[PDB]
Amino acid sequence: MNVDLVFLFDGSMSLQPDEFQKILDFMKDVMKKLSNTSYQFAAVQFSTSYKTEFDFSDYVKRKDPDALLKHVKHMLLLTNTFGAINYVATEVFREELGARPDATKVLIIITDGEATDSGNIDAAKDIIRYIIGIGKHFQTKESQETLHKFASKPASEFVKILDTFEKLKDLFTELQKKI
Numbered sequence: 365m366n367v368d369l370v371f372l373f374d375g376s377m378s379l380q381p382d383e384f385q386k387i388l389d390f391m392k393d394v395m396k397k398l399s400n401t402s403y404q405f406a407a408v409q410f411s412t413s414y415k416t417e418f419d420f421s422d423y424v425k426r427k428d429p430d431a432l433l434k435h436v437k438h439m440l441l442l443t444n445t446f447g448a449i450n451y452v453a454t455e456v457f458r459e460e461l462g463a464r465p466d467a468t469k470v471l472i473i474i475t476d477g478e479a480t481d482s483g484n485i486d487a488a489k490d491i492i493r494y495i496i497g498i499g500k501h502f503q504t505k506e507s508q509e510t511l512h513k514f515a516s517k518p519a520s521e522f523v524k525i526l527d528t529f530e531k532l533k534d535l536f537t538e539l540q541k542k543i
């Protein structure tokens with residue numbers, strides 16, 4: 365089961381330091397669970413700009429989530445989600461970076477709010493896309509709906525809403541069962 369999975373995680377100024385750390389720990393939890401499988405991983409932080417923290421070929425070389433994320437620094441700027449998702453589609457899923465032609469493409473987006481930019485994500489639409497929206501900005505059904513445009517269909521499966529960043533641990537507990 366070859367899966368190329370990318371974490372696209374929010375580094376905007378609205379995240380508290382401990383919240384940003386909980387995202388990193390969540391990504392490590394998932395990668396450790398899937399060590400020695402046919403999964404490959406890449407990770408991109410987005411805020412105003414988009415930084416690839418590691419590509420698939422970095423993961424293949426190291427297979428060490430702690431080492432791969434050791435130097436991540438919280439950008440503390442905007443939340444340009446449209447640009448970020450397009451970036452993943454065109455700049456991360458590439459064979460030259462270790463992506464596999466035969467693999468199933470998965471994108472896991474983690475964010476605390478609405479995009480600050482605009483456009484479309486059509487270039488990424490064939491990727492299986494989950495989005496995890498966390499915190500006070502997604503308490504109403506109306507506010508939760510703003511995330512649907514980024515995720516695969518139906519939203520009932522592919523959009524996860526969490527009350528706090530502490531619930532990422534609980535989400536992992538549930539996800540790990542699906543392995």
Ligand SMILES: CN1C(=O)N(c2cc(Cl)cc(Cl)c2)C(=O)[C@]12CN(Cc1cc(C(=O)O)cs1)C[C@H]2c1ccc(C#N)cc1
Binds near residue numbers: 495539
């Ligand atoms: C179920 N599901 C799922 O919840 N998420 C998921 C993972 C993460 Cl980090 C956050 C969120 Cl929020 C959602 C996933 O990535 C999958 C989709 N599937 C790959 C696919 C296979 C096919 C197919 O048609 O064969 C389509 S997509 C593999 C699943 C999976 C991957 C990793 C863990 C763990 N730990 C548990 C399950």
